[PDB]
Amino acid sequence: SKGEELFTGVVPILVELDGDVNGHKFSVRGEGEGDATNGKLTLKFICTTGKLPVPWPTLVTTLVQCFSRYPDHMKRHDFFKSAMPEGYVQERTISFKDDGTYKTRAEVKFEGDTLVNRIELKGIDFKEDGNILGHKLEYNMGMSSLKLLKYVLFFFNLLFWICGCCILGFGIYLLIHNNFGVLFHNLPSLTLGNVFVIVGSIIMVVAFLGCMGSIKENKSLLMSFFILLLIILLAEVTLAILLFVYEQKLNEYVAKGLTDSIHRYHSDNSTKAAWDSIQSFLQCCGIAGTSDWTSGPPASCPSDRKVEGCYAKARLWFHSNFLYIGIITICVCVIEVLGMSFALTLNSQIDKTSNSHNVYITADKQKNGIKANFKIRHNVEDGSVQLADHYQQNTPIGDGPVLLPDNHYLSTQSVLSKDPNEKRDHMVLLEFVTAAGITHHHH
Ligand SMILES: CCCCCCCC/C=C\CCCCCCCC(=O)OC[C@H](O)CO
Numbered sequence: 260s261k262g263e264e265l266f267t268g269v270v271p272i273l274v275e276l277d278g279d280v281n282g283h284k285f286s287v288r289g290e291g292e293g294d295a296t297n298g299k300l301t302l303k304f305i306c307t308t309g310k311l312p313v314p315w316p317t318l319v320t321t322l323v324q325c326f327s328r329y330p331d332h333m334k335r336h337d338f339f340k341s342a343m344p345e346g347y348v349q350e351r352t353i354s355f356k357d358d359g360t361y362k363t364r365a366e367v368k369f370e371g372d373t374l375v376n377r378i379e380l381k382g383i384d385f386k387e388d389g390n391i392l393g394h395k396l397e398y399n400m401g402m403s404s405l406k407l408l409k410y411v412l413f414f415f416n417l418l419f420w421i422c423g424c425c426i427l428g429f430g431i432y433l434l435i436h437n438n439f440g441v442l443f444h445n446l447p448s449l450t451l452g453n454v455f456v457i458v459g460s461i462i463m464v465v466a467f468l469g470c471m472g473s474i475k476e477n478k479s480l481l482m483s484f485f486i487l488l489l490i491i492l493l494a495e496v497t498l499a500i501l502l503f504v505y506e507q508k509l510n511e512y513v514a515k516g517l518t519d520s521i522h523r524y525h526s527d528n529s530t531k532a533a534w535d536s537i538q539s540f541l542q543c544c545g546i547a548g549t550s551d552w553t554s555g556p557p558a559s560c561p562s563d564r565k566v567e568g569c570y571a572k573a574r575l576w577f578h579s580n581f582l583y584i585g586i587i588t589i590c591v592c593v594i595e596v597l598g599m600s601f602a603l604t605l606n607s608q609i610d611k612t613s614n615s616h617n618v619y620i621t622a623d624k625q626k627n628g629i630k631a632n633f634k635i636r637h638n639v640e641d642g643s644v645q646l647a648d649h650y651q652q653n654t655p656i657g658d659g660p661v662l663l664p665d666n667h668y669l670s671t672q673s674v675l676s677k678d679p680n681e682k683r684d685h686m687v688l689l690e691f692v693t694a695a696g697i698t699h700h701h702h
């Protein structure tokens with residue numbers, strides 16, 4: 260082709276984009292150089308109107324496939340170069356999933372000694388707090404790893420979040436609905452409702468940190484989730500060992516607290532309510548029996564012969580069921596440490612280093628041009644991906660004979676950079692495009 264005769268060397272490039280996305284108007288000017296022999300592009304685009312209202316990666320597809328390297332056996336399929344020097348018209352409809360669409364029209368021609376790309380872009384129906392207008396896309400053009408822990412953590416913590424909400428709710432119910440008094444006048448906080456509220460609240464904040472940290476891939480929330488679980492786990496084992504090295508030292512302590520509380524029963528309405536509800540519920544009477552009430556047991560005591568003591572019955576219950584609560588203890592512990600391992604693992608597989616995209620080319624007999632369609636996974640700040648659905652049509656501007664090709668594709672690789680000197684909003688881009696899809700000879 261005579262168009263490839265125009266592309267044997269490195270050709271200066273000029274790119275101009277005037278755009279409008281939901282009324283946000285902007286202009287981009289890019290300059291650079293195009294080496295079609297190696298399929299390399301080096302360009303530096305600058306936003307002439309201030310700051311770009313969209314993420315720079317969304318513009319790189321709209322921002323010259325005539326510099327694609329078609330290997331020698333595929334050269335007779337290079338429509339783009341054949342359309343030169345009189346150029347070709349490239350139209351596109353880029354549909355961002357669950358968001359707006361770019362609508363594009365562009366003319367690519369040789370103007371003087373330079374290959375020029377003039378584009379007007381109009382975007383409609385975008386979310387103002389979406390990934391596009393909210394600048395939530397990473398500044399790159401590769402695919403990112405799927406973090407399945409993102410979903411595992413979010414799933415369990417959502418369930419634990421709801422469990423905690425119900426535990427907190429039942430505690431809120433008991434604080435308002437029922438009155439079981441205060442067993443220890445000095446520890447007013449120690450009520451059955453408050454312990455529900457305390458444990459429920461702690462569960463919700465841990466589950467909240469796990470949910471928000473995992474689904475948004477926020478390292479700081481993951482570390483907070485880890486540190487908080489670590490602290491809860493450390494207190495648990497501390498209490499467990501501290502409990503058994505000093506069981507008898509704190510056995511006395513609560514026994515003093517109960518004996519102190521029982522002196523107040525005929526003078527403190529709250530401690531009376533505590534003893535009355537406890538005894539009538541557990542069907543017990545004193546600390547170790549009915550003799551603790553030296554003037555006679557209150558009415559809310561089983562009148563049976565040797566009713567067991569409330570404190571004795573409780574300690575016997577925990578000693579008799581130590582094996583069960585031990586199983587439940589290590590169960591909550593392993594769930595706890597599993598979440599720690601998950602979070603710590605997920606944290607390490609964030610912010611990593613860094614891919615190819617294929618533009619499938621198909622001929623259009625009737626408009627004497629080509630069509631193309633392809634999907635681009637833009638990487639979102641929360642780890643998810645934003646689909647950009649691309650449909651394309653290219654028609655030659657001139658009446659000269661152009662080449663209509665067999666189906667083939669272009670393996671594009673783009674590298675986004677930043678000029679450390681540019682104080683203006685900008686994008687330094689390196690691309691490598693090579694044609695493929697048609698194999699020659701016998702292999
Ligand atoms: C809502 C969908 C998720 C619901 C799931 C409910 C069942 C989860 C139970 C066990 C999963 C085992 C957890 C696997 C932990 C390792 C995952 C991992 O590290 O992989 C991440 C990355 O993809 C590199 O491998």
Ligand SMILES: *[C@@H]1O[C@H](CO)[C@@H](O)[C@H](O)[C@H]1NC(C)=O
Pocket residue numbers: 525526527528
């Ligand atoms: C508790 O409430 C009663 C209501 O009968 C009230 O008369 C009294 O001031 C309080 N009783 C004691 C023992 O403090």
